[PDB]
Amino acid sequence: MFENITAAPADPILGLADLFRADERPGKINLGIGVYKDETGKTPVLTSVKKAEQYLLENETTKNYLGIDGIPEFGRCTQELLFGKGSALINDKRARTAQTPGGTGALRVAADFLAKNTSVKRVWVSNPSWPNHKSVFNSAGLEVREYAYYDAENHTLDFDALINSLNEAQAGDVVLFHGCCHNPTGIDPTLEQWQTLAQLSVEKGWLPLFDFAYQGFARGLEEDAEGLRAFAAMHKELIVASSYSKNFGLYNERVGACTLVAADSETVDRAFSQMKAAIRANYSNPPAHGASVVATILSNDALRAIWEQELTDMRQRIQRMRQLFVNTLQEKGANRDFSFIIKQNGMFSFSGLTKEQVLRLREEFGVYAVASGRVNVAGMTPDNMAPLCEAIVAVL
Amino acid sequence: MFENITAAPADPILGLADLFRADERPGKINLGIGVYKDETGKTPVLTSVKKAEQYLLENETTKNYLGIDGIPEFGRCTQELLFGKGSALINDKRARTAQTPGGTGALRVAADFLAKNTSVKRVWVSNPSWPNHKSVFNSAGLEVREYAYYDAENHTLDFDALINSLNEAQAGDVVLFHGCCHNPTGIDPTLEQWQTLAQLSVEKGWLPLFDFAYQGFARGLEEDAEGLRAFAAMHKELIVASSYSKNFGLYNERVGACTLVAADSETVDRAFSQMKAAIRANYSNPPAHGASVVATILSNDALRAIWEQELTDMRQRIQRMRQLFVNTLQEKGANRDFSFIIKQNGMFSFSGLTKEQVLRLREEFGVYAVASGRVNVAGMTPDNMAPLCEAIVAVL
């Protein structure tokens, strides 16, 4: 029976939406969206995907099931996006990709895989991190440990505290990294911190699980992977859960992948079969649509050229909204160096506002931010940058 | 590490496909597909969905995330498809539907819901049943009990053995029913067996979990639900996992739903929130595509009229391939009453062939059937009905 089931709490994101889409003051602003918005304040569908969809609409002849791993062309592409082209990983066939229902689905299946085929009991998530991480892992039955990361004072990657907390991890634990655009700090390890953090990762014997979901939002497709790639040079085994929900604007089509790298072809094919069984038990096979779109775009030199350009457009909008934000504040009369904002990558960053400040900002000005003072830079337009920075200063 | 992971076994369906799509004898036939095929031997995409997709292609303006429960219009529609129109269930708001990645995803989330919010430890699957059921439930951590069902001798619903085995179930167990087209027997409870089986279900206190995936393939959309509806009149709580993969031909888009019925609005909304948390932890939100298609079709009086007609077409093809099969055998010279075939509904039925017979049929004739002697009636065309029945008789 259900009558005594105790109602769940409000999600650390979703709640805002509602008080937002209710806030009688239309002059409002929402910065706790996590989704991208253009200069208009709309989340359009990429032209490349539109072209991609009409193509499929014209070409699909059946909607018969996909393999448990989804569409091959999609798999090989993500592989090349992650590890590059001449990646031995690929050439030796010690990587197997499965199309999953989004980055989350990739995480949960890597979870159910690990949690039911290996002795991995704990997964080291950083402090802070995307909130759903824990829920995902915990639902697999695994425990979520936390390694330090953010430096509240200096607004940076406290590498010391980082390696420090990690040592408390036993050889055998899965340590969860963010390929680029660390949600929610927006602070990322330099190619040098990664390399050391990778070598120190083989020595202690960590099982790396890369959450790669904002590839292309920091520096570009290639650059944004140099980290994962660094770990993938030293490690013989690893798991990477990629999400095409942001960079291809395919949010709701649930497009992502769970790549598995093992020492060699035989071991990866052996383990992957078990990864497949984890999927058949979850949702059987993946939703073709979003992936068909992503496969054709990436395999079409013309359509890919457009996509790449569209992505760089998004990257640059955000990459400039940070400056507008920072210097507009300096004009509005702020007494606080917000420069650290410019240094950060991706859609997110921590404004440095107190849970109290973020509350009066909403309550007295209609500006919505995550309780964590996390602010979505992509929800800022030149049009609202002025009143935004205004409200913020009034509450500093 | 993965190097010692022991490779998984071959799926009780998928293995065939491969020896099929390899069998050098092109005169082959595949009857262990589980998917529908037209007179051509192709799994086309419904015209209504094609029209539905061009509509969306023309109308979508964003691919922003769906609610954890997916699209509302889809939810209300499935609700009306399941419980009917004037269903108090609907009018009192004691039913909440969540768009899930297919019937399987609906099952797994009902699983993870139950397994993490109620004392339900075992789920009574029938003997036999769709093989992935167990794997789904077991992956939730719940145990799969088995109640008798098929009558190998008389090829029928052994009601006695059925109610019989069920009594060994404690008030508190989830008993898994098949709304219509029992995969794989193709044998279904009459409106009268259902009603008794429903009343005897409230008395013992079972938690009904209806796997509804072939709605429209037995008698029609309305008729095919009179069972679920019977249980939903007597019960104050129940769960139904519906799949739009067959009847809308949307196989690979993963379209399905997990409906939850509780005693009243307050309890259902309270429990459902927990069902939502189970989803956010699994894949976050559902793939919009397949569901958008299904929502518009069902909400468009014109497009729905076409869909309904297309479905009735499929229903009748299968519903006639059974006769062709039966009487062609009687002509080919069979010494065995295969009449029971005509009595059965849906795409599947048990030919009554031994695992040995099905093997020589494949090995010596290129006819593929599931080890269980299960035969997919929708893979039979007038063109291959002749050699098929021929091979079968030669092995009787």
Ligand SMILES: Cc1ncc(COP(=O)(O)O)c(CN)c1O
């Ligand atoms: C770091 C991180 N990982 C995974 C995801 C999931 O993306 P998806 O909706 O494709 O699951 C997100 C959501 N933005 C995220 O921020």
Ligand SMILES: Cc1ncc(COP(=O)(O)O)c(CN)c1O
């Ligand atoms: C009885 C039963 N339940 C659930 C399913 C799942 O359908 P889906 O691929 O939509 O998950 C099937 C597959 N035919 C089935 O036969």
Ligand SMILES: O=C(O)CCCC(=O)O
């Ligand atoms: O805003 C975020 O970072 C969370 C997005 C999670 C999701 O859309 O599933």
Ligand SMILES: O=C(O)CCCC(=O)O
């Ligand atoms: O043939 C069957 O009945 C199994 C189909 C299962 C699936 O397609 O996931």
